Amino acid sequence: SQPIKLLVGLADPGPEYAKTRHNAGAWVVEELARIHNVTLKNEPKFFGLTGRLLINSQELRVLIPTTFMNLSGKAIAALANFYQIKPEEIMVAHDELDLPPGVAKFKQGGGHGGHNGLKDTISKLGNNKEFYRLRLGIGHPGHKDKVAGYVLGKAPAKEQECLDAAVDESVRCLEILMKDGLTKAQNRLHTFKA
């Protein structure tokens, strides 16, 4: 038994942005869908790429928005509302600045942290912060003002392995979450540091 009906991987659309740090959330959803053999369908009604996975043996919906980052809320709200999914049953995977590359953490609630995606999500789900997040560490640059370009950049090769390891392990622990629950999934993921 466990709370998550919809995993969302946040993203800037198109091939120019596919390898940037701000697209980490989507890397999770992408790997998890490759491993469970699901191809994401473009559903314009839901402003994104969606799909449905059977994972031991729970019904998990997945979504990568094709909106601008700052309107990810439209996709998540349109999909949630149509399948009758509540905020507390949504996990949103996103690049986290406050954590380094190689690290990932589950959490419920909290701030957007200046992340435009999470901001609009809070807002379109009706000023409700209490969806889960999967926070993927990406580090942060030197100055508050460099941030936007840090996130719209491609991590160099060696940081990108640390990232790819946290994606890999986040997926595994999402499989754990569906078999053993959040608590066990969380203990395991929060001892991982690449």
Swiss-Prot record:
E.C. number(s) listed in UniProt: 3.1.1.29
GO molecular-function terms, A-Z: peptidyl-tRNA hydrolase activity; tRNA binding
InterPro entries: Pept_tRNA_hydro, Pept_tRNA_hydro_CS, Pept_tRNA_hydro_sf
Binding site residues for tRNA: Y17, F68, N70, N116
A GO biological process held by the record: rescue of stalled ribosome
Sites annotated Discriminates between blocked and unblocked aminoacyl-tRNA: D12
Any one GO cellular component localisation term in the record: cytoplasm
Marked site positions, Stabilizes the basic form of H active site to accept a proton: D95
Catalytic residue positions: H22
Compartmental location: Cytoplasm
Recorded catalytic activity of this chain's protein: an N-acyl-L-alpha-aminoacyl-tRNA + H2O = an N-acyl-L-amino acid + a tRNA + H(+)
UniProt keywords, alphabetically: Cytoplasm, Hydrolase, RNA-binding, tRNA-binding
Domain of life: Bacteria
Pfam family, one: Pept_tRNA_hydro
Keyword Cytoplasm: yes
Subunit structure: Monomer.
Family: Belongs to the PTH family.
Function (record text): Hydrolyzes ribosome-free peptidyl-tRNAs (with 1 or more amino acids incorporated), which drop off the ribosome during protein synthesis, or as a result of ribosome stalling. Catalyzes the release of premature peptidyl moieties from peptidyl-tRNA molecules trapped in stalled 50S ribosomal subunits, and thus maintains levels of free tRNAs and 50S ribosomes.
UniProt-recorded name of the protein: Peptidyl-tRNA hydrolase
Lineage, opening ranks: Bacteria, Pseudomonadati, Pseudomonadota, Gammaproteobacteria, Vibrionales
